[PDB]
Amino acid sequence: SHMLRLSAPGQLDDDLCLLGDVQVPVFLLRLGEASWALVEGGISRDAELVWADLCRWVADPSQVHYWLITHKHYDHCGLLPYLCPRLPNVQVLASERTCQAWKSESAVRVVERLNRQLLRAEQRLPEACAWDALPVRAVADGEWLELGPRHRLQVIEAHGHSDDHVVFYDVRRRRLFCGDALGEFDEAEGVWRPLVFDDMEAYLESLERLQRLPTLLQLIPGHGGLLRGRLAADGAESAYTECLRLCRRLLWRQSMGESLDELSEELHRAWGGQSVDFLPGELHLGSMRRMLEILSRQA
Ligand SMILES: O=C(Nc1cccc(-c2cc[nH]n2)c1)c1cccc2cn[nH]c12
Numbered sequence: 001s002h003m004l005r006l007s008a009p010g011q012l013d014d015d016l017c018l019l020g021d022v023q024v025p026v027f028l029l030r031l032g033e034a035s036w037a038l039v040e041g042g043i044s045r046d047a048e049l050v051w052a053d054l055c056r057w058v059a060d061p062s063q064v065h066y067w068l069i070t071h072k073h074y075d076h077c078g079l080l081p082y083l084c085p086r087l088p089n090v091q092v093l094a095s096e097r098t099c100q101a102w103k104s105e106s107a108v109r110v111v112e113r114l115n116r117q118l119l120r121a122e123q124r125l126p127e128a129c130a131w132d133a134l135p136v137r138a139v140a141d142g143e144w145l146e147l148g149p150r151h152r153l154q155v156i157e158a159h160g161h162s163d164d165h166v167v168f169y170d171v172r173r174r175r176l177f178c179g180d181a182l183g184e185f186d187e188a189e190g191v192w193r194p195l196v197f198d199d200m201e202a203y204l205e206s207l208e209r210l211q212r213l214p215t216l217l218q219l220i221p222g223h224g225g226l227l228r229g230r231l232a233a234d235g236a237e238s239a240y241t242e243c244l245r246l247c248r249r250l251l252w253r254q255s256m257g258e259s260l261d262e263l264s265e266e267l268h269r270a271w272g273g274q275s276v277d278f279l280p281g282e283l284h285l286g287s288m289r290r291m292l293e294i295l296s297r298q299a
């Protein structure tokens with residue numbers, strides 16, 4: 001492993017643990033002697049794993065008071081209906097548009113179907129509360145989340161990966177929970193792979209804004225662990241650079257009369273291995289195709 005990337009379950013910092021699978025992690029913040037928060041909402045099939053991990057750190061789960069959600073994608077909120085019943089005092093903090101997704105019958109259907117595809121034949125999920133019954137509080141762009149005496153995180157709108165996406169900035173710790181707004185970190189090559197699934201202009205503009213934050217010390221995306229050192233400090237800029245690189249590549253191949261399916265297959269070839277254990281089957285190729293369609297339209 002690489003000294004600039006913490007990618008093991010367990011303790012990451014004095015106040016911070018990684019629960020579950022590093023590829024779809026749930027982060028545990030210690031807010032005080034009797035108060036905790038969760039960050040990122042994972043995939044449903046990981047309910048009992050994340051629960052087991054949680055209970056090793058939290059002896060009384062009624063002390064879990066907040067659960068912060070970056071966006072509505074199935075791999076970032078799948079745990080909520082299954083673990084919220086076990087967390088009687090928790091408040092789910094999510095953007096207005098993320099909360100709307102949980103009231104949309106069609107949207108919930110997609111989230112459930114994609115999560116159901118990841119169940120091993122053996123396992124049954126816990127008893128769930130309704131998606132429209134989650135204990136949510138909508139948070140706004142720029143709102144300060146006063147989680148505890150040493151934990152103050154700002155909500156920052158970061159649309160473009162999805163139309164609801166937000167990030168959470170802990171300025172005391174120069175720590176950004178950035179979800180998927182910078183893309184997928186390539187663990188073999190150390191660069192960002194873009195994840196532009198809604199709007200390229202918004203994705204780039206969000207990265208421009210995130211570069212203006214005070215220098216990061218810890219950068220925590222939706223997948224793959226915690227980045228530090230130069231990877232944190234340069235992350236938002238590097239993600240922006242890699243998105244333009246893919247645009248130029250797309251423009252290059254199209255200028256040679258190539259269909260979108262060619263670069264789609266190449267990108268699936270080069271990039272799909274990392275997420276195969278939580279991204280079911282055809283979705284990664286289809287996602288690459290959707291991203292190239294978006295880039296091709298807005299360029
Ligand atoms: O395609 C992905 N996710 C996804 C999930 C849910 C919906 C849509 C989506 C919406 C429109 N087109 N596609 C896309 C993906 C691919 C590779 C690594 C990661 C990490 N997080 N996600 C990743």
Ligand SMILES: [Fe+3]
Binds near residue numbers: 076161162180
């Ligand atoms: Fe996503």
Ligand SMILES: [Fe+3]
Binds near residue numbers: 180
């Ligand atoms: Fe994701």
